Ligand binder design. Structure first.
Ligand SMILES: Nc1ncnc2c1ncn2[C@@H]1O[C@H](COP(=O)(O)OP(=O)(O)O)[C@@H](O)[C@H]1O
Ligand SMILES: Nc1ncnc2c1ncn2[C@@H]1O[C@H](COP(=O)(O)OP(=O)(O)O)[C@@H](O)[C@H]1O
Ligand SMILES: [Mg+2]
Ligand SMILES: [Mg+2]
Ligand SMILES: [Zn+2]
Ligand SMILES: [Zn+2]
Lengths: 623, 192, 555
DNA sequence: GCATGCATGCGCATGCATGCAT
DNA sequence: ATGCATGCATGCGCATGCATGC
């Protein structure tokens, strides 16, 4: 080892070799130890799984290392650069000793993770330079691949001999003399015969959610190498484990003088997606290791019970009283509809997601529901009234930080792809901003045509909108359309519209007061697993009975809505019904859509608009 | 503003911070700094090197104002606060009953406080804006009056005359306690 | 020092060229190279599937070592053509390959594929003017007057490292003789990743391609093409005596992704011509095409016929006074919400090969018309085409036409009227042709069509742009039970049977081929047709009498 | 209640003049 | 001794904010 360190190579190697065979955790449960016998050593089983599959990478938790011993953990945290190759060679030796004749592409590498989490980046000090650090953040920019040279190829002008030079300390010393003809300065570098590696630059936005008073959000720059390139996408919330670096800045490109103040930099070695509070992402849904057979059996047994649907509506948000219909609609939005493909038909993309609007007085808990949905669902975005512009959404023109690449930069709606976008104070939004939503809510695509840029982007986003009456009060003398004041085209694209009113019931007031005062003084993991399994396994289909039921429901809806004063019906609404039915099919884990789902969708649609209580010929609601 | 001469504009100075003195000063604070005056290279540019930085019934709010006995306990409860436990208070009145003096007294009494008069601090004055850096040479976000008044008390005078966007931002602060900005070059959620 | 692999590749490729027997017994490549006598031809096209049937070892070596082997293959081809024919020694020759059985995504082009043979797909966004480029220059020493020839330039202006005379050892004084140098054609193109390869929340990536020699001619802007070539690093850690780089793609052949009446007839195969003839001799072509392009849409046959007539278009003419007569047709649609208004535009998108679609304020003024920017390697300027220019001789779809700004509407009116875009910016003055046909969708001011008001009072459109449109369609949602039942049947049938509910008579490719063949014709007007048109116009004008209720549009 | 005219900041590229580090 | 990076306008393209006019 280099001077200034107390790390001993042989001792660390022996310690890691012993640890890979001796470590056993009794507290580990089958909830996360999938396909591994807890009674047997864990990391040996992981190495066996690696041998079976052939993946040359192994993941090691830092907490396990600390539990085994503290000296090794401290040495690894302090000096990763020397410790990591020792771990790699020890793992390679053990793997080749236990499993001969195995075939791979290169030696096995080790990636540590779950080190001690720094609460805030701005709390770091120069003492922490070149140390292992873990971060939590959201990706907003990813650059293109950059090649970095590792070996250099040199050719002679006269004799044309082939030589190779390996980079050392980041600098390549080209030979000044030949090897066959001994001619001075006769060697020329060939770029295309060299060896290159991938490098990518990513940008993170930090949000530890426990910021001090008056602290603004922070932006961090990360660099990824090799296979880690393109493992994340913009809008994803990830945990990054890596190393902290400091790089000097030149005064100018053509002068060797550099500034005394250095530049911060971070190198990435590990990514983590799982979160203890949010739902599973799309990356996990494309794997088979998520669910153990016991949990699958438990979920299948639970799904057979009839009330589980309502049970789910009870388990969505226990902090908000009642509102069963709203919770059921939110659950149906979360499940979603069947994503059919219509490329051969020429009709184009078909929206399989549900958009929901909530209208009511300001003294309502719609904002709490929006905040809960935003915090619960990954890839969620939040906007409020006039704070967002038409150009703020979609994309806007910005130059590359170095050259004139004309780099389009994504907006809130694009970052909400395959996610949920919540809008509060939908009334204050201008017509220019609603013009974007007009295309987004239906075509699921955005067309951009500006100077030197012509492109189409995917905008598969489901929208939760909140609105208010004219005078912040629901005037009984005015009709629903008058109170809402929204265009028919905009309202027609919403699958469900929930009108929240105050009936002034004494029992309701007593219950609300009791719940609010008591606030002073199902398992989430089970719900997450059930939702993921339902969403990633079953593609519902509908039968003839559902067809006839939907036709009858459509004609009945048109007859009901023919009267003036109420919200009229359009053929598009019919499609909405189908989506809702499909959502119900995902609730019961049924691949076939039955009449029960259609009836439930019709009931929800009828109850959402309060059409039963509303006077059909005057448009005035009176309970 | 007290030391500014007649008809002039306040002047600015630059201070460098190193060592354990770092992370002491914050924007909007009244501070006293003891340091050395040194130039930078026959003209030269000057700067300061800091050595020490320092910060500068009970219902008796504004004894100068007669009456309003029941209008002063509410201000005390606002200052104390709840256990979200925030409190917002609005006073509507005919002109000449001296509402502004109470707001000024509240602003002076509170440790972290901001006071707004009207359109002179509208738009960019609230929320936040993106500006170049002195050291890094890149773009960073600087907050407005609401951001500075985080975990404090803000005072607004002539509330009815404010613009629609400012009123919507104030409503968002009151109900959600966070500001959401999504415009060209800005995509942030600020805690207020 | 000997390059053994290169020599073996030369030998095997020469043997393949000399020995490959076709299905008819002769050699295709001998006859193909017999056409290389002309000075305008320098590249020979060789198929890869034929190589797969000749030497798998040679195929693998070429695929895994394309950059190292390609100049030696060029030398072998030069020797072959020199042996087979009397050609001046100054001419050079190149080889191209087409039928690669695999494709790679743009985002899949990692650094591990540098120097290998790949085939990708993309969309052209911009093209640069033709230029000459050095290959191997000749340098004269200023000290000892020694002539140094055949120095490789690669991708930078590289002088000889040191004088080949050991005594001289001059490294900084040389003269370049342009007369004795070696040149080649060079063009730069920009390509964009297609929408089908876009991952979640990602913006399409841009790549740079370079075309040499005859391949420079093709790859026009706005096309969707497949390229075959290699990935090579170009300079843009530091070296020392005892490094910034970027990725650039070199392409060998460019092909259409999905592929003058006599020329069209000759190009088409026997079966394609048979299908065209079968289509031509059917009256139901007027009806069947309506079912072919719009299978799912129920009713609205008038809109379908108008769209077909707009697609086919007319014949433009010029007068003796210097004026020009329009030959294109523009169509406008107005209707109640959800009356299948936006489906026609999407169908035209999917069917037409050259179509650009815009909506409301999403397109800026610079987005339309064109832009002018600098050339990166010369004093010239290049023009970035707008939406209208990309849809030249095609169809441009505009949805939410009322939301467009007044300036944008004025620009659109100018484009419709003069059919020419004039740019006078950045020291560049130019005029460009935009012969497009516009299909537009609009909504009433109140959101519903007023039956008791005229068309002018229902749409917030200026009279000039209103008068330019040829056909206006109005759709009203009738509160009829039978229509609702019919629409519901079709919607539920489409949702129940994802792909089995379509019974198209002709495929879209056949329709595209027939349209391409038919658009070349220029029919004339018969004598009796003149009198018939005069009488019919007289009747149409007589319809405007005061004895009948007011019409919504005057003639 | 909203689109537009009139400043103004932002980010950028391009052209003209000059002053000296390798 | 010579060629180049930088300081100082200026056009280009754009978004954003304030005022008003129908
Ligand atoms: N109750 C009161 N006791 C003492 N002074 C008062 C009282 N009400 C008003 N004043 C005087 O009248 C003036 C009112 O001015 P100002 O505070 O600007 O009124 P407002 O705040 O209503 O616009 C103050 O200078 C204050 O000295
Ligand atoms: N005549 C019709 N035949 C079949 N489907 C229809 C018809 N009219 C409307 N639809 C259905 O209703 C939807 C209308 O949406 P869209 O065409 O976007 O309305 P608009 O273009 O008026 O905004 C389409 O998805 C289409 O499937
Ligand atoms: Mg006052
Ligand atoms: Mg439409
Ligand atoms: Zn040599
Ligand atoms: Zn010489």
């Amino acid at each position: 080892v280099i001077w200034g360190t107390d790390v001993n190579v042989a001792a660390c190697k022996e310690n890691f070799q012993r640890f890979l065979q001796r470590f056993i955790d009794p507290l580990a449960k089958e909830e996360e130890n999938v396909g591994i016998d807890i009674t047997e050593p864990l990391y040996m089983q992981r190495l066996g799984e690696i041998n079976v599959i052939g993946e040359p990478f192994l993941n090691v938790n830092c907490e396990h290392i600390k539990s085994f011993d503290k000296n090794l953990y401290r040495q690894l945290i302090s000096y990763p650069q020397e410790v990591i190759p020792t771990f790699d060679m020890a793992v390679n030796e053990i793997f080749f000793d236990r499993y001969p004749d195995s075939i791979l592409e290169h030696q096995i590498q080790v990636r540590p993770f779950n080190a001690l989490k720094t609460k805030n980046m701005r709390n770091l000090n120069p003492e922490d330079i070149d140390q292992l650090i873990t971060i939590s953040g959201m990706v907003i920019r990813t650059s293109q691949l950059i090649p970095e040279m590792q070996e250099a190829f040199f050719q002679c002008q006269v004799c044309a001999h082939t030589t190779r030079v390996e980079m050392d300390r980041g600098r390549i010393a080209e030979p000044s003399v030949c090897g066959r003809c001994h001619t001075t300065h006769s060697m020329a570098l060939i770029h295309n015969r060299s060896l290159f590696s991938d490098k990518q630059m990513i940008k993170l936005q930090e949000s530890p959610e426990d910021m001090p008073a008056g602290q603004t959000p922070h932006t961090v720059i990360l660099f990824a190498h090799n296979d880690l390139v393109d493992k994340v996408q913009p809008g994803d919330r990830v945990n990054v484990t890596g190393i902290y670096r400091a790089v000097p800045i030149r005064v100018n490109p053509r002068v060797s003088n550099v500034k005394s103040v250095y530049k911060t930099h971070i190198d990435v070695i590990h990514y983590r997606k799982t979160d203890a509070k949010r739902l599973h992402g799309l990356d996990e849904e494309a794997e088979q290791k998520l669910f153990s057979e016991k949990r699958v059996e438990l979920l299948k047994e639970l799904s057979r019970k009839p009330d589980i649907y309502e049970r789910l509506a009870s388990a969505l948000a226990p902090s908000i009283y009642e509102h069963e219909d709203i919770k059921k609609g939110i659950l149906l939005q979360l499940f979603g509809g069947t994503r059919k493909d219509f490329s051969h038909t020429g009709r184009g993309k078909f929206r399989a997601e549900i958009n929901i609007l909530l209208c009511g007085d300001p003294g309502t808990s719609k904002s709490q529901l929006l905040q809960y949905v935003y915090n619960l669902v990954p890839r969620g975005q939040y906007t409020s009234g006039k704070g967002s512009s038409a150009v703020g959404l979609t994309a806007y023109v910005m130059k590359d930080p170095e050259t004139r690449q004309l780099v389009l930069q994504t907006g809130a709606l694009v970052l909400s792809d395959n996610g949920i976008c919540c809008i509060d104070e939908f009334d204050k939004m201008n017509e220019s901003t609603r013009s974007v939503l007009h295309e987004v809510m239906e075509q699921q695509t955005l067309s951009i045509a500006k100077a030197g840029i012509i492109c189409q982007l995917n905008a598969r986003t489901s929208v939760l909108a909140a609105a208010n009456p004219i005078e912040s009060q629901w005037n009984p003398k005015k009709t629903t359309i008058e109170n809402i004041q929204l265009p028919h085209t905009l309202l027609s694209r919403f699958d469900l519209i929930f009108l929240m009113l105050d009936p002034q019931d004494e029992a309701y007031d007593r219950r609300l007061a009791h719940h609010l005062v008591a606030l002073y003084y199902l398992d989430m993991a089970v719900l997450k697993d059930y939702i993921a399994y339902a969403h990633s396994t079953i593609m519902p289909r509908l039968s003839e009975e559902a067809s006839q039921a939907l036709i009858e429901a459509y004609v009945d809806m048109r007859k009901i809505g023919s009267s003036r004063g109420m919200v009229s019906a359009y053929p598009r609404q019919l499609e909405s019904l189908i989506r809702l039915a499909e959502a119900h099919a995902k609730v019961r884990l049924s691949n076939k859509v039955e009449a029960i789902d259609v009836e439930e969708a019709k009931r929800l649609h009828r109850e959402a608009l309060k059409q039963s209580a509303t006077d059909p010929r005057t448009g005035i609601v009176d309970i | 503003s007290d030391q500014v001469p007649v008809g002039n504009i306040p002047r600015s100075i630059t201070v460098l911070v190193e060592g354990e003195n770092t992370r002491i000063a914050q924007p909007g604070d009244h501070v006293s700094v003891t340091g050395i005056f040194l130039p930078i290279l026959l003209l030269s540019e000057t700067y300061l090197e800091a050595h020490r930085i320092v910060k500068m019934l009970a219902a008796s709010i504004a004894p100068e104002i007669y009456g309003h006995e029941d209008v002063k306990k509410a201000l005390l409860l606002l200052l104390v606060g709840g256990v979200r436990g925030n409190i917002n208070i609005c006073l509507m009145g005919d002109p000449g009953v001296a509402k502004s003096q109470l707001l000024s007294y509240i602003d002076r009494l509170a440790p972290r406080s901001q006071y707004t008069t009207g359109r002179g601090s509208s738009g960019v004055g609230l929320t936040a804006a993106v500006l170049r850096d002195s050291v890094s040479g890149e773009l960073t976000l600087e907050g407005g009056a609401l951001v500075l008044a985080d975990q404090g008390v803000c005072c607004i005078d002539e509330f009815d005359k404010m613009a629609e966007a400012d009123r919507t931002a104030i409503h968002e602060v009151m109900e959600q306690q966070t500001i959401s900005i999504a415009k060209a070059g800005i995509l942030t959620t600020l805690n207020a | 020092v000997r390059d053994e692999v290169a020599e073996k590749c030369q030998k095997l490729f020469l043997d393949f060229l000399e020995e490959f027997q076709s299905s008819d017994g002769e050699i295709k490549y001998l006859q193909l190279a017999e056409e290389l006598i002309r000075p305008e031809r320098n590249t020979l096209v060789v198929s890869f599937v034929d190589l797969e049937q000749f030497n798998q070892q040679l195929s693998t070596t070429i695929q895994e070592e394309f950059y190292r082997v390609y100049p030696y293959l060029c030398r072998a081809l030069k020797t072959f053509v020199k042996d087979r024919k009397e050609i001046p020694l100054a001419k050079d020759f190149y080889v191209a390959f087409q039928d690669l059985p695999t494709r790679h995504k743009i985002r899949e082009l990692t650094s591990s594929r540098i120097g290998l043979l790949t085939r990708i797909s993309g969309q052209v966004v911009r093209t640069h003017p033709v230029h000459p480029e050095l290959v191997s220059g000749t340098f004269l020493c200023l000290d000892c007057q020694t002539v140094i020839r055949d120095v490789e330039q690669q991708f930078k202006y590289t002088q000889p490292n040191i004088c080949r005379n050991p005594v001289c050892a001059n490294r900084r004084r040389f003269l370049l003789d342009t007369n004795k140098s070696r040149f080649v054609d060079f063009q730069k193109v920009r390509i964009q990743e297609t929408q089908a390869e876009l991952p979640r929340g990602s913006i399409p990536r841009s790549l740079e391609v370079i075309l040499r020699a005859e391949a420079v001619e093709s790859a026009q802007a706005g096309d969707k093409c497949d390229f075959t070539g290699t990935l090579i690093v170009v300079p843009d850690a530091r070296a020392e005596t005892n490094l910034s780089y970027r990725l650039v793609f070199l392409a060998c052949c460019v092909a259409p992704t999905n592929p003058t009446a006599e020329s069209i007839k000759n190009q088409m195969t026997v079966k394609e011509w048979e299908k065209v003839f079968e289509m031509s001799q059917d009256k139901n072509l007027y009806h069947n095409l309506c079912t072919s392009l719009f299978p799912t849409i129920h009713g609205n046959d008038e809109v379908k016929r108008g769209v077909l007539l707009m697609l086919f278009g007319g014949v433009p003419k010029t007068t003796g006074e210097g004026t020009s007569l329009r030959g294109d047709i523009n169509v406008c649609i107005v209707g109640d919400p959800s009356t299948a208004k936006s489906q026609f535009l999407k169908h035209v998108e999917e069917f037409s090969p050259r179509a650009v679609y815009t909506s409301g304020k999403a397109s800026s003024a610079a987005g339309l018309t064109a832009a002018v920017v600098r050339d990166e390697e010369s004093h010239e300027f290049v023009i970035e085409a707008g939406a209208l220019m990309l849809a030249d001789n095609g169809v441009c779809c505009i949805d939410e036409f009322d939301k467009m700004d007044v300036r944008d509407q004025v620009a659109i009116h100018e484009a419709m009227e003069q059919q020419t875009i004039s740019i006078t910016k950045a020291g560049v003055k130019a005029t460009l042709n935009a012969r497009t046909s516009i299909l537009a969708a609009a909504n009433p001011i109140s959101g519903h069509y007023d039956r008791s008001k005229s068309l002018k009072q229902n749409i917030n459109l200026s009279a000039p742009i209103m008068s330019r449109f040829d056909l206006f369609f109005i759709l009203v949602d009738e509160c009829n039970e039978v229509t609702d039942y019919a629409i519901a049947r079709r919607i539920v049938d489409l949702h129940s049977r994802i792909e089995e509910s379509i019974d198209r008579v002709y495929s879209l490719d056949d329709i595209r081929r027939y349209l391409l063949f038919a658009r070349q014709f220029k029919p004339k007007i018969s004598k009796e047709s003149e009198d018939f048109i005069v009488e019919q116009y007289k009747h149409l004008r007589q319809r405007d009498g005061s004895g009948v209720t007011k019409s919504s549009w005057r003639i």
